Write a protein that holds these residues in place. Structure first.
Motif, short mmCIF file in Angstrom:
data_model
loop_
_atom_site.label_atom_id
_atom_site.label_comp_id
_atom_site.label_asym_id
_atom_site.label_seq_id
_atom_site.Cartn_x
_atom_site.Cartn_y
_atom_site.Cartn_z
N UNK A 4 -3.84 -6.75 1.18
CA UNK A 4 -3.59 -5.35 0.82
C UNK A 4 -4.19 -4.41 1.85
N UNK A 5 -3.66 -3.19 1.87
CA UNK A 5 -4.17 -2.17 2.77
C UNK A 5 -4.26 -0.87 1.99
N UNK A 6 -5.21 -0.04 2.37
CA UNK A 6 -5.30 1.29 1.80
C UNK A 6 -4.49 2.25 2.67
N UNK A 7 -3.89 3.25 2.04
CA UNK A 7 -3.19 4.29 2.76
C UNK A 7 -4.21 5.35 3.15
N UNK A 8 -4.53 5.41 4.44
CA UNK A 8 -5.62 6.25 4.91
C UNK A 8 -5.17 7.66 5.20
N UNK A 9 -4.01 7.82 5.83
CA UNK A 9 -3.54 9.13 6.22
C UNK A 9 -2.03 9.11 6.32
N UNK A 10 -1.45 10.31 6.43
CA UNK A 10 -0.03 10.49 6.70
C UNK A 10 0.08 11.47 7.86
N UNK A 11 0.65 11.01 8.97
CA UNK A 11 0.59 11.75 10.22
C UNK A 11 1.99 12.12 10.70
N UNK A 20 -0.88 5.88 7.96
CA UNK A 20 -1.93 5.06 8.55
C UNK A 20 -2.45 4.11 7.48
N UNK A 21 -2.41 2.81 7.77
CA UNK A 21 -2.86 1.80 6.83
C UNK A 21 -4.17 1.21 7.34
N UNK A 22 -5.20 1.28 6.51
CA UNK A 22 -6.42 0.49 6.70
C UNK A 22 -6.27 -0.78 5.86
N UNK A 25 -7.94 -4.33 9.97
CA UNK A 25 -6.93 -4.02 10.97
C UNK A 25 -6.17 -2.76 10.57
N UNK A 26 -5.81 -1.96 11.57
CA UNK A 26 -5.16 -0.68 11.32
C UNK A 26 -3.76 -0.68 11.92
N UNK A 27 -2.79 -0.25 11.12
CA UNK A 27 -1.39 -0.22 11.53
C UNK A 27 -0.73 1.03 10.98
N UNK A 28 0.39 1.38 11.60
CA UNK A 28 1.25 2.44 11.12
C UNK A 28 2.49 1.84 10.47
N UNK A 29 2.99 2.52 9.45
CA UNK A 29 4.32 2.27 8.91
C UNK A 29 4.96 3.63 8.66
N UNK A 58 1.30 8.02 -1.66
CA UNK A 58 0.11 8.84 -1.70
C UNK A 58 -1.01 8.17 -0.93
N UNK A 59 -1.71 8.96 -0.12
CA UNK A 59 -2.88 8.47 0.58
C UNK A 59 -3.90 7.99 -0.44
N UNK A 60 -4.44 6.80 -0.22
CA UNK A 60 -5.38 6.22 -1.14
C UNK A 60 -4.81 5.25 -2.13
N UNK A 61 -3.55 4.86 -1.98
CA UNK A 61 -3.00 3.77 -2.76
C UNK A 61 -3.02 2.51 -1.92
N UNK A 62 -3.17 1.38 -2.59
CA UNK A 62 -3.08 0.10 -1.91
C UNK A 62 -1.61 -0.24 -1.76
N UNK A 63 -1.22 -0.65 -0.57
CA UNK A 63 0.09 -1.23 -0.32
C UNK A 63 -0.11 -2.67 0.13
#
Ligand SMILES: NC[C@H]1O[C@H](O[C@H]2[C@H](O)[C@@H](O[C@H]3O[C@H](CO)[C@@H](O)[C@H](N)[C@H]3O)[C@H](N)C[C@@H]2N)[C@H](O)[C@@H](O)[C@@H]1O
Ligand SMILES: [Mg+2]
Ligand SMILES: [Mg+2]
Ligand SMILES: [Mg+2]
Ligand SMILES: [Mg+2]
Ligand SMILES: [Mg+2]
Ligand SMILES: [Mg+2]
Ligand SMILES: [Mg+2]
Ligand SMILES: [Mg+2]
Ligand SMILES: [Mg+2]
Ligand SMILES: [Mg+2]
Ligand SMILES: [Mg+2]
Ligand SMILES: [Mg+2]
Ligand SMILES: [Mg+2]
Ligand SMILES: [Mg+2]
Ligand SMILES: [Mg+2]
Ligand SMILES: [Mg+2]
Ligand SMILES: [Mg+2]
Ligand SMILES: [Mg+2]
Ligand SMILES: [Mg+2]
Ligand SMILES: [Mg+2]
Ligand SMILES: [Mg+2]
Ligand SMILES: [Mg+2]
Ligand SMILES: [Mg+2]
Ligand SMILES: [Mg+2]
Ligand SMILES: [Mg+2]
Ligand SMILES: [Mg+2]
Ligand SMILES: [Mg+2]
Ligand SMILES: [Mg+2]
Ligand SMILES: [Mg+2]
Ligand SMILES: [Mg+2]
Ligand SMILES: [Mg+2]
Ligand SMILES: [Mg+2]
Ligand SMILES: [Mg+2]
Ligand SMILES: [Mg+2]
Ligand SMILES: [Mg+2]
Ligand SMILES: [Mg+2]
Ligand SMILES: [Mg+2]
Ligand SMILES: [Mg+2]
Ligand SMILES: [Mg+2]
Ligand SMILES: [Mg+2]
Ligand SMILES: [Mg+2]
Ligand SMILES: [Mg+2]
Ligand SMILES: [Mg+2]
Ligand SMILES: [Mg+2]
Ligand SMILES: [Mg+2]
Ligand SMILES: [Mg+2]
Ligand SMILES: [Mg+2]
Ligand SMILES: [Mg+2]
Ligand SMILES: [Mg+2]
Ligand SMILES: [Mg+2]
Ligand SMILES: [Mg+2]
Ligand SMILES: [Mg+2]
Ligand SMILES: [Mg+2]
Ligand SMILES: [Mg+2]
Ligand SMILES: [Mg+2]
Ligand SMILES: [Mg+2]
Ligand SMILES: [Mg+2]
Ligand SMILES: [Mg+2]
Ligand SMILES: [Mg+2]
Ligand SMILES: [Mg+2]
Ligand SMILES: [Mg+2]
Ligand SMILES: [Mg+2]
Ligand SMILES: [Mg+2]
Ligand SMILES: [Mg+2]
Ligand SMILES: [Mg+2]
Ligand SMILES: [Mg+2]
Ligand SMILES: [Mg+2]
Ligand SMILES: [Mg+2]
Ligand SMILES: [Mg+2]
Ligand SMILES: [Mg+2]
Ligand SMILES: [Mg+2]
Ligand SMILES: [Mg+2]
Ligand SMILES: [Mg+2]
Ligand SMILES: [Mg+2]
Ligand SMILES: [Mg+2]
Ligand SMILES: [Mg+2]
Ligand SMILES: [Mg+2]
Ligand SMILES: [Mg+2]
Ligand SMILES: [Mg+2]
Ligand SMILES: [Mg+2]
Ligand SMILES: [Mg+2]
Ligand SMILES: [Mg+2]
Ligand SMILES: [Mg+2]
Ligand SMILES: [Mg+2]
Ligand SMILES: [Mg+2]
Ligand SMILES: [Mg+2]
Ligand SMILES: [Mg+2]
Ligand SMILES: [Mg+2]
Ligand SMILES: [Mg+2]
Ligand SMILES: [Mg+2]
Ligand SMILES: [Mg+2]
Ligand SMILES: [Mg+2]
Ligand SMILES: [Mg+2]
Ligand SMILES: [Mg+2]
Ligand SMILES: [Mg+2]
Ligand SMILES: [Mg+2]
Ligand SMILES: [Mg+2]
Ligand SMILES: [Mg+2]
Ligand SMILES: [Mg+2]
Ligand SMILES: [Mg+2]
Ligand SMILES: [Mg+2]
Ligand SMILES: [Mg+2]
Ligand SMILES: [Mg+2]
Ligand SMILES: [Mg+2]
Ligand SMILES: [Mg+2]
Ligand SMILES: [Mg+2]
Ligand SMILES: [Mg+2]
Ligand SMILES: [Mg+2]
Ligand SMILES: [Mg+2]
Ligand SMILES: [Mg+2]
Ligand SMILES: [Mg+2]
Ligand SMILES: [Mg+2]
Ligand SMILES: [Mg+2]
Ligand SMILES: [Mg+2]
Ligand SMILES: [Mg+2]
Ligand SMILES: [Mg+2]
Ligand SMILES: [Mg+2]
Ligand SMILES: [Mg+2]
Ligand SMILES: [Mg+2]
Ligand SMILES: [Mg+2]
Ligand SMILES: [Mg+2]
Ligand SMILES: [Mg+2]
Ligand SMILES: [Mg+2]
Ligand SMILES: [Mg+2]
Ligand SMILES: [Mg+2]
Ligand SMILES: [Mg+2]
Ligand SMILES: [Mg+2]
Ligand SMILES: [Mg+2]
Ligand SMILES: [Mg+2]
Ligand SMILES: [Mg+2]
Ligand SMILES: [Mg+2]
Ligand SMILES: [Mg+2]
Ligand SMILES: [Mg+2]
Ligand SMILES: [Mg+2]
Ligand SMILES: [Mg+2]
Ligand SMILES: [Mg+2]
Ligand SMILES: [Mg+2]
Ligand SMILES: [Mg+2]
Ligand SMILES: [Mg+2]
Ligand SMILES: [Mg+2]
Ligand SMILES: [Mg+2]
Ligand SMILES: [Mg+2]
Ligand SMILES: [Mg+2]
Ligand SMILES: [Mg+2]
Ligand SMILES: [Mg+2]
Ligand SMILES: [Mg+2]
Ligand SMILES: [Mg+2]
Ligand SMILES: [Mg+2]
Ligand SMILES: [Mg+2]
Ligand SMILES: [Mg+2]
Ligand SMILES: [Mg+2]
Ligand SMILES: [Mg+2]
Ligand SMILES: [Mg+2]
Ligand SMILES: [Mg+2]
Ligand SMILES: [Mg+2]
Ligand SMILES: [Mg+2]
Ligand SMILES: [Mg+2]
Ligand SMILES: [Mg+2]
Ligand SMILES: [Mg+2]
Ligand SMILES: [Mg+2]
Ligand SMILES: [Mg+2]
Ligand SMILES: [Mg+2]
Ligand SMILES: [Mg+2]
Ligand SMILES: [Mg+2]
Ligand SMILES: [Mg+2]
Ligand SMILES: [Mg+2]
Ligand SMILES: [Mg+2]
Ligand SMILES: [Mg+2]
Ligand SMILES: [Mg+2]
Ligand SMILES: [Mg+2]
Ligand SMILES: [Mg+2]
Ligand SMILES: [Mg+2]
Ligand SMILES: [Mg+2]
Ligand SMILES: [Mg+2]
Ligand SMILES: [Mg+2]
Ligand SMILES: [Mg+2]
Ligand SMILES: [Mg+2]
Ligand SMILES: [Mg+2]
Ligand SMILES: [Mg+2]
Ligand SMILES: [Mg+2]
Ligand SMILES: [Mg+2]
Ligand SMILES: [Mg+2]
Ligand SMILES: [Mg+2]
Ligand SMILES: [Mg+2]
Ligand SMILES: [Mg+2]
Ligand SMILES: [Mg+2]
Ligand SMILES: [Mg+2]
Ligand SMILES: [Mg+2]
Ligand SMILES: [Mg+2]
Ligand SMILES: [Mg+2]
Ligand SMILES: [Mg+2]
Ligand SMILES: [Mg+2]
Ligand SMILES: [Mg+2]
Ligand SMILES: [Mg+2]
Ligand SMILES: [Mg+2]
Ligand SMILES: [Mg+2]
Ligand SMILES: [Mg+2]
Ligand SMILES: [Mg+2]
Ligand SMILES: [Mg+2]
Ligand SMILES: [Mg+2]
Ligand SMILES: [Mg+2]
Ligand SMILES: [Mg+2]
Ligand SMILES: [Mg+2]
Ligand SMILES: [Mg+2]
Ligand SMILES: [Mg+2]
Ligand SMILES: [Mg+2]
Ligand SMILES: [Mg+2]
Ligand SMILES: [Mg+2]
Ligand SMILES: [Mg+2]
Ligand SMILES: [Mg+2]
Ligand SMILES: [Mg+2]
Ligand SMILES: [Mg+2]
Ligand SMILES: [Mg+2]
Ligand SMILES: [Mg+2]
Ligand SMILES: [Mg+2]
Ligand SMILES: [Mg+2]
Ligand SMILES: [Mg+2]
Ligand SMILES: [Mg+2]
Ligand SMILES: [Mg+2]
Ligand SMILES: [Mg+2]
Ligand SMILES: [Mg+2]
Ligand SMILES: [Mg+2]
Lengths: 275, 48
Positions: free
Chosen positions: A75-82, A93-95, A100-104, A111-116
């Motif tokens: 899982x990753x947290x949604x850190x930001x939307x850029x 931005x996924x933490x 590891x950090x990636x963009x989708x 919403x920032x702060x949901x797990x994907x």
RNA sequence: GCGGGGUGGAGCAGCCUGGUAGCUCGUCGGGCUCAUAACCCGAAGGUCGUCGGUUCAAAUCCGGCCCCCGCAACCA
RNA sequence: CCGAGGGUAGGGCCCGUGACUGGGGCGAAGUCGUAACAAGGUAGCUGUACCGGAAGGUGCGGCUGGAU
RNA sequence: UGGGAGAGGGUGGUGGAAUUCCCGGAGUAGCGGUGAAAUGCGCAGAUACCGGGAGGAACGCCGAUGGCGAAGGCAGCCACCUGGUCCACCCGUGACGCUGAGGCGCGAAAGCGUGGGGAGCAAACCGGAUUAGAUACCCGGGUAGUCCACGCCCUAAACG
RNA sequence: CGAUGUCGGCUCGUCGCAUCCUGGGGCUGAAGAAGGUCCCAAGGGUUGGGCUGUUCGCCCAUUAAAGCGGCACGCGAGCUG
RNA sequence: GAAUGCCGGCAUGAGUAACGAUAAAGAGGGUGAGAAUCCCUCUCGCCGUAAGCCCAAGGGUUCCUACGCAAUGGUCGUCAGCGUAGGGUUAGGCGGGACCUAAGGUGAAGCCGAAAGGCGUAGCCGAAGGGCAGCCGGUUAAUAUUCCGGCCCUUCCCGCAGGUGCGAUGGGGGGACGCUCUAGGCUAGGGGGACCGGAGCCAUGGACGAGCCCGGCCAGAAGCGCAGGGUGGGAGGUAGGCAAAUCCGCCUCCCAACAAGCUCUGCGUGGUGGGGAAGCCCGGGUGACAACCCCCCGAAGCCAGGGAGCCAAGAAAAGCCUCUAAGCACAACCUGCGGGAACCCGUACCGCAAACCGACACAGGUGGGCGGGUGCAAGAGCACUCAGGCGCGCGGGAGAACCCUCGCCAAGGAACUCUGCAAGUUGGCCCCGUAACUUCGGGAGAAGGGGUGCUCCCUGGGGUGAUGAGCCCCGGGGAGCCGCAGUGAACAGGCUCUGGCGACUGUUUACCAAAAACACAGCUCUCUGCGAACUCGUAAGAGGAGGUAUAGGGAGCGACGCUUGCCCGGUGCCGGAAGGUCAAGGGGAGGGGUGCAAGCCCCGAACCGAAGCCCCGGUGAACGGCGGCCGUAACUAUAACGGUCCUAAGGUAGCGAAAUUCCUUGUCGGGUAAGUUCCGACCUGCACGAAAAGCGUAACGACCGGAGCGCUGUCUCGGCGAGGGACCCGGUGAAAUUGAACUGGCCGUGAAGAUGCGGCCUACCCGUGGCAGGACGAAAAGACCCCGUGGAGCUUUACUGCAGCC
RNA sequence: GAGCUAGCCCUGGCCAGGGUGAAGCUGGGGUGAGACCCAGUGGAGGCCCGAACCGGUGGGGGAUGCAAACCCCUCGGAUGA
């Protein structure tokens, strides 16, 4: 929801810019940018091979993750939307709990702060990625691979989406944004939800200069040229087309289908596009 | 107004220079032709 | 200058491919209706712009004359 | 200094008139149709929209002030 | 305070019948339409029949002379949010009421803007009949629109 | 055609006379005044505007009169354009 | 002897035009064979956001000195960027290299191509970008961050001391970023001082003065002070950063947050080292133990990687820090100190120009920095002016026509003319005031007006400082003075009404067109499911796009408003598993040649057989098209109405004598004394009409029309004045042109327009300033037209190919 | 042959001064809550005026030119395509 301007100049009359409300982080993740070599429409020969390109804003390419099956189960947290200048959509931005950090590209409502999370047993939740064969029929979906493990190719533009219509063997039937009915392989990944920023089409550029900032050099009509240049060139005074409307290279441009007839993928398209 | 000759030592050397010549079939034929004629200088003098 | 046209009262066939003038409307006599229109039944009217020629024979083919539309009249 | 008023410039209201133009009212026996009154021969009226020489027609919804 | 009836409103879901289209099968010489017909569709395989799929719209029976709302209006089913209202008890406040120029809000349909949507229907429009004519009534097509979101329009035989 | 620059304007004129005005005459359907028509006469004169590129023409206000023509439709090694 | 022949020589025009910005010259003294032109002095003028100074590029000895004057110098020359000769360019710190990457180039691997060659991952190259250590002064005829002096610093090697898990081309951080606006504190820079220093000055009527004139600094290590910037500390878990990792990333827990602490820059100060004017005297000497202080203004620069906002979303790599890996921990690295080491190339000079690009000592072109003072609201604008630099390499006269640039004008005021072309007028700031219309922004600087100087008096707020003085910046009220005139000089909108076209800011025919053309946001059609379509390429490969139908291509229309009708027969495009036609191939009825024959060989019908075409449908913001004749109303006239022929269908809305109307200056109305243009109408629209869009539209326009006011030399109608030429003199000295010439007028003649022929008339020889009628004057082998079985660009349902596609 | 010219790419730099005053934010009024209105702050724009800079509108000169496209007066843009 787009943002208007008062007519304090001629071009502010109709100019509309995006509201940028979903944006949370206003500078890109340095670890995930690379220089975007501006082409200006020219190829390796130096030749213009796409007319009317060049001279637009400098940009840094943000490396977008299109094969989410690279991290199944993490899982990753949604850190930001850029803001990404390389696409109509926003990006998230996924933490990862990996660290590891990636963009989708950001789906609509994410919403920032949901797990994907991505994988066969993942939930059917906005932002999760599954092989197509595990998403229930009728679910809207985006970032759809066209062939397994080859990368998200379909539905990536703002507000686009593809609806799962039914399954058939190793293949599921998708309705792409064009309305075409296609058989895409079930092992192809896809992120549930529609791409966000759907108001992107409601933007009124407003003036010529804005087309220039987007890298779009001015576009001159065949009718404005001489016969040396264009099928529609020349004439004394103005002139209708005087022949079936044609491209600069002679081929007809009102109706003439150009898809290669004997394409192998014809076997997998069910219905050509609507409208 | 601005005229057509705007001298530039780098441009001159990277365009008509000896090495620009040798890198190309038409450029080595130049040197050949200019040698055969007995050109004193096979190539522009540029001071660098 | 080149092109097409002129035929019962109106508008059109027939001229090409020589013998025979036809279609709709109109007009006239009768019917129906209280009456008119509509509708129904019958009938009349064109010597084919005009003169000349070819011919056994001319609306028709060939000339001239008359009139009527159409196209053209560019380079200075 | 103020000051009748004269002058320059710009406004506002009213009136008369104007090529031309719109509908309107009226005027024994002109032209076209026949929309309405009978279910007026497509029940009528209706707000609206589009169309048509003209009354009108049609769509959508509404009314009975509609017959049987 | 305790109770009750209801298509009252908004939001999100969702169920079957039916029409249309599409794919598969089975099948042959017409189907459709009308006063009668023609246009139209059909041996390039239509109509009728079966299985499959996509999609939109409207909710049959219940249904009533019924119920609800201030009016316009509201009808498949489910949940959430919310309005009004009636009854019992006779507990509280103690005239705190009524009406209402302006104001503000709501306001069927058609209509407009920006997106979407689009099965059926259908102004305009085309065609076929009728007709003296038929820019109609009837028939075959058919585009806006009818549907959704947001914003307008604010009309009415908006009537008891 | 190894080039004779082509409209009109402006400037500069000069000549013809089939005379617009002015001078001299004859005839008159010449009373006078004012006209008509012809003859003789080229000395001089023959306006300023509105319109159009215009020449021309129509128009305004005058005038003794608002003449017509030739000079490469006079004149761009004189101007304009 | 002719070829507008070729090469050369020399003529003509002619002592003619011209001698290159109208910024400007005069005298005295030198030198010398010779002096407007060289040197010195004095006077005068010109630039001063340069016409001054410093870089870069390019140029390449032009630099400095001596000696020269044939040529070069538009004249002269003693001078010179010229001739000869000698001299001159000094670096660990500046720039470039021994560092790094950018586009791009090249390119082990790999791919492609007849050859040549084309691509291409890494890597390499590649700079005016990143990184990196020097400031001030003196000295030479000529170099100076380079030599010297002073005070600072960098890297490499070696050693010493202390410290530490040391160690990388590998991991990570960082380097590292836009546009606009902007705070605090400084510095550059500048103004003032009755304070400090200075050779002197008192004039010409006054002044011995708080008088005039000149100057009052520069750099500097540690430390310190002011202002900023960068930065949380610890612990545990850890599956990601292609090995590892104590680093980074993610999670958790304790403390710390406008702080503090640590670290870094700026400025200030700082031991010390410099500099130091006018004036005088001959680059120097003095001045001079020069003084070196106070206040104000103040950046666009600095602190800086500061702050805020915005969308179009803003290089890379190394240096550097950190993590570890092999290895190694006698190591190695880190810090401090010391001694040693520190290479190659550039350095003169010109550099908005006489040294660069323009054939020229050419009125043109050339990127960056500094660019002082005062006044005018500001400013890099304008005028004058400092430093500094120039008077433009022919002069002297004269005071004609004429030309150029400029000044003024009685009365009139567009009568000029294609046109107010040109030139007037208007002009800055402050205050009052400001219409139709509008998309509510605008229109608007609308229009139109008033004010504007100097002096005295009273008074309000800011900045600095201290709350005060002084300085500096914004104001308010009152009373006066002078002139024709107060933005007293210079820079600095003329305005209004009304149409056409185009929405608008933009773009264009370098060098005759800037527009109504192109572009433009916006609208629609269409193609494209991604190894997309499309484009370049034989290909590989690229672009498209590290994009994915809210995207990308093509086409038309062109903000916006209201709209965009009828025709699918023809052409195009799309759909159509039937039918028709259809090449190679399949098939082989049936023939033929030859052989004794087995056989060999040839021809060949039916039939099967793609795309394409035929055929059936669809399709207009696809190519396109959207009728004719005759009749009819109770005055006339006109025809709502009717008849018929034809078509695929007969032009709807709205516009209309129009950027379209031929007849035409249509007719009517407006405007004018008068209007072929203009505006408003009518509609028999030769020959508007709906995305080659129709009709409108506020705002915009160096677009093109029309009108009015203002104002004027445009004009009636011309006059006078200025300077630069033209003229005269001295110096220098071209050009196209040219069969030769001893080159008149008329009327004729002539190849039809005669100086040259005939007749007549006129006429002494030679110039100079002038004018342009002629020499069918010069120039350019007519660019129009025709011819040529000449050429080239373009087009198409001309022919025949080819690419491409099927 | 792109040292001229045209387009693109990479990397730098330049744009005196003055004017106008959008969104937002704040305060106040307004309402059930709003919309909204007023002030202040703010500093947007192919915004305005105008040097540098980029142009080349009209006119005049020049025409064997200073110049094979120049000179003068006037004029367009000048935070942006
Ligand atoms: N010629 C002079 C006459 O002219 C009119 O009369 C005429 C009417 O106008 C017509 O009426 C039409 O027009 C009306 C308008 O609505 C319609 O209602 C009506 N249905 C129509 O038929 C009618 N057909 C004939 C009549 N003679 C005057 O009235 C009459 O005084 C005068 O003498
Ligand atoms: Mg706004
Ligand atoms: Mg957003
Ligand atoms: Mg970056
Ligand atoms: Mg990094
Ligand atoms: Mg390349
Ligand atoms: Mg290449
Ligand atoms: Mg399988
Ligand atoms: Mg839109
Ligand atoms: Mg849009
Ligand atoms: Mg464009
Ligand atoms: Mg485009
Ligand atoms: Mg275009
Ligand atoms: Mg063209
Ligand atoms: Mg070409
Ligand atoms: Mg072509
Ligand atoms: Mg072509
Ligand atoms: Mg054409
Ligand atoms: Mg054309
Ligand atoms: Mg045309
Ligand atoms: Mg020039
Ligand atoms: Mg040259
Ligand atoms: Mg250069
Ligand atoms: Mg270059
Ligand atoms: Mg070789
Ligand atoms: Mg070769
Ligand atoms: Mg007849
Ligand atoms: Mg007839
Ligand atoms: Mg016939
Ligand atoms: Mg009858
Ligand atoms: Mg009947
Ligand atoms: Mg007869
Ligand atoms: Mg006859
Ligand atoms: Mg006879
Ligand atoms: Mg006979
Ligand atoms: Mg006969
Ligand atoms: Mg006959
Ligand atoms: Mg006759
Ligand atoms: Mg002609
Ligand atoms: Mg009064
Ligand atoms: Mg008086
Ligand atoms: Mg009086
Ligand atoms: Mg009567
Ligand atoms: Mg009658
Ligand atoms: Mg009816
Ligand atoms: Mg009736
Ligand atoms: Mg009825
Ligand atoms: Mg009834
Ligand atoms: Mg109709
Ligand atoms: Mg109508
Ligand atoms: Mg009719
Ligand atoms: Mg009709
Ligand atoms: Mg109808
Ligand atoms: Mg109702
Ligand atoms: Mg209860
Ligand atoms: Mg209850
Ligand atoms: Mg069959
Ligand atoms: Mg309701
Ligand atoms: Mg009870
Ligand atoms: Mg009780
Ligand atoms: Mg009680
Ligand atoms: Mg009480
Ligand atoms: Mg009580
Ligand atoms: Mg009320
Ligand atoms: Mg309503
Ligand atoms: Mg509705
Ligand atoms: Mg509308
Ligand atoms: Mg009939
Ligand atoms: Mg009819
Ligand atoms: Mg009809
Ligand atoms: Mg109809
Ligand atoms: Mg009712
Ligand atoms: Mg000729
Ligand atoms: Mg002439
Ligand atoms: Mg004149
Ligand atoms: Mg005569
Ligand atoms: Mg006399
Ligand atoms: Mg007599
Ligand atoms: Mg008499
Ligand atoms: Mg008399
Ligand atoms: Mg005479
Ligand atoms: Mg005429
Ligand atoms: Mg005449
Ligand atoms: Mg006339
Ligand atoms: Mg008289
Ligand atoms: Mg003539
Ligand atoms: Mg002439
Ligand atoms: Mg001329
Ligand atoms: Mg002329
Ligand atoms: Mg010659
Ligand atoms: Mg010659
Ligand atoms: Mg020669
Ligand atoms: Mg001579
Ligand atoms: Mg001479
Ligand atoms: Mg000269
Ligand atoms: Mg000179
Ligand atoms: Mg001078
Ligand atoms: Mg003496
Ligand atoms: Mg002497
Ligand atoms: Mg001597
Ligand atoms: Mg100055
Ligand atoms: Mg100078
Ligand atoms: Mg100079
Ligand atoms: Mg350099
Ligand atoms: Mg040189
Ligand atoms: Mg000499
Ligand atoms: Mg000499
Ligand atoms: Mg000389
Ligand atoms: Mg490198
Ligand atoms: Mg290569
Ligand atoms: Mg460098
Ligand atoms: Mg360095
Ligand atoms: Mg120094
Ligand atoms: Mg010496
Ligand atoms: Mg020095
Ligand atoms: Mg370590
Ligand atoms: Mg920006
Ligand atoms: Mg400093
Ligand atoms: Mg003192
Ligand atoms: Mg005294
Ligand atoms: Mg003293
Ligand atoms: Mg730990
Ligand atoms: Mg990973
Ligand atoms: Mg790792
Ligand atoms: Mg790994
Ligand atoms: Mg690891
Ligand atoms: Mg501390
Ligand atoms: Mg510290
Ligand atoms: Mg001393
Ligand atoms: Mg600066
Ligand atoms: Mg500066
Ligand atoms: Mg600067
Ligand atoms: Mg070395
Ligand atoms: Mg040097
Ligand atoms: Mg210089
Ligand atoms: Mg410079
Ligand atoms: Mg020089
Ligand atoms: Mg030279
Ligand atoms: Mg010179
Ligand atoms: Mg020069
Ligand atoms: Mg400066
Ligand atoms: Mg003053
Ligand atoms: Mg000096
Ligand atoms: Mg000098
Ligand atoms: Mg001079
Ligand atoms: Mg003289
Ligand atoms: Mg004299
Ligand atoms: Mg002259
Ligand atoms: Mg005057
Ligand atoms: Mg006047
Ligand atoms: Mg005119
Ligand atoms: Mg005019
Ligand atoms: Mg003018
Ligand atoms: Mg305003
Ligand atoms: Mg004003
Ligand atoms: Mg105006
Ligand atoms: Mg004064
Ligand atoms: Mg203070
Ligand atoms: Mg101005
Ligand atoms: Mg007009
Ligand atoms: Mg324009
Ligand atoms: Mg502008
Ligand atoms: Mg041009
Ligand atoms: Mg050119
Ligand atoms: Mg040219
Ligand atoms: Mg040329
Ligand atoms: Mg050219
Ligand atoms: Mg322009
Ligand atoms: Mg549009
Ligand atoms: Mg190609
Ligand atoms: Mg190809
Ligand atoms: Mg390829
Ligand atoms: Mg890409
Ligand atoms: Mg797109
Ligand atoms: Mg409007
Ligand atoms: Mg029709
Ligand atoms: Mg068609
Ligand atoms: Mg068809
Ligand atoms: Mg067709
Ligand atoms: Mg057809
Ligand atoms: Mg064949
Ligand atoms: Mg065959
Ligand atoms: Mg076959
Ligand atoms: Mg076939
Ligand atoms: Mg067909
Ligand atoms: Mg079209
Ligand atoms: Mg009649
Ligand atoms: Mg009819
Ligand atoms: Mg049809
Ligand atoms: Mg027409
Ligand atoms: Mg129509
Ligand atoms: Mg006309
Ligand atoms: Mg008209
Ligand atoms: Mg026309
Ligand atoms: Mg008009
Ligand atoms: Mg069209
Ligand atoms: Mg409007
Ligand atoms: Mg313009
Ligand atoms: Mg005109
Ligand atoms: Mg006009
Ligand atoms: Mg004025
Ligand atoms: Mg004059
Ligand atoms: Mg003079
Ligand atoms: Mg003769
Ligand atoms: Mg003769
Ligand atoms: Mg003669
Ligand atoms: Mg002389
Ligand atoms: Mg002459
Ligand atoms: Mg010739
Ligand atoms: Mg011609
Ligand atoms: Mg020709
Ligand atoms: Mg031939
Ligand atoms: Mg030929
Ligand atoms: Mg270039
Ligand atoms: Mg260029
Ligand atoms: Mg601007
Ligand atoms: Mg010019
Ligand atoms: Mg230029
Ligand atoms: Mg031009
Ligand atoms: Mg001129
Ligand atoms: Mg001027
Ligand atoms: Mg101008
Ligand atoms: Mg400006």
């Amino acid at each position: 929801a787009v943002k208007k301007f008062k007519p304090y100049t001629p071009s502010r009359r109709f100019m509309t810019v995006a509201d940028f409300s979903e944006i949370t982080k206003t500078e890109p993740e340095k670890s995930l940018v690379k220089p975007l070599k501006k082409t200006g429409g020219r190829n390796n020969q130096g030749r213009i091979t796409v007319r009317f390109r060049g001279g637009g804003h400098k940009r840094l390419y943000r490396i977008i993750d299109f094969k989410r099956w690279d991290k199944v189960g993490i899982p990753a947290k949604v850190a930001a939307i850029e803001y990404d200048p390389n696409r109509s959509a926003r990006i998230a931005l996924l933490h990862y709990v990996d660290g590891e950090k990636r963009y989708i590209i950001a789906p609509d409502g994410l919403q920032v702060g949901q797990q994907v999370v991505a994988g066969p047993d993942a939930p059917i939740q906005v932002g999760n990625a599954l092989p197509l064969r595990f998403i229930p029929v009728g679910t809207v979906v985006h970032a759809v691979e066209l062939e397994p493990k080859k990368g998200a190719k379909l539905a990536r533009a703002a507000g686009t989406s593809a609806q799962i219509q039914g399954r058939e063997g190793d293949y599921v039937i998708l309705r792409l944004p064009s309305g075409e009915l296609r058989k895409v392989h079930g092992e192809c990944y896809a992120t549930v939800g529609a791409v966000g920023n759907a108001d992107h089409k409601n933007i009124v550029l407003g003036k010529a200069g804005r087309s220039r900032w987007l890298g779009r050099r001015p576009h001159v009509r065949g009718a404005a040229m001489n016969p040396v240049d264009h099928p529609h060139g020349g004439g004394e005074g103005r002139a209708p087309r005087g022949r079936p409307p044609a491209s600069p290279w002679g081929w007809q441009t009102k109706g003439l289908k150009t898809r290669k007839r004997r394409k192998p993928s014809s076997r997998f398209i069910i219905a050509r596009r609507k409208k | 107004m601005k005229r057509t000759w705007q001298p530039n030592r780098r441009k001159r050397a990277k365009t008509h220079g000896f090495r620009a010549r040798m890198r190309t079939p038409g450029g080595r034929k130049v040197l050949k032709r200019r040698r055969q004629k007995g050109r004193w200088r096979l190539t522009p003098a540029v001071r660098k």
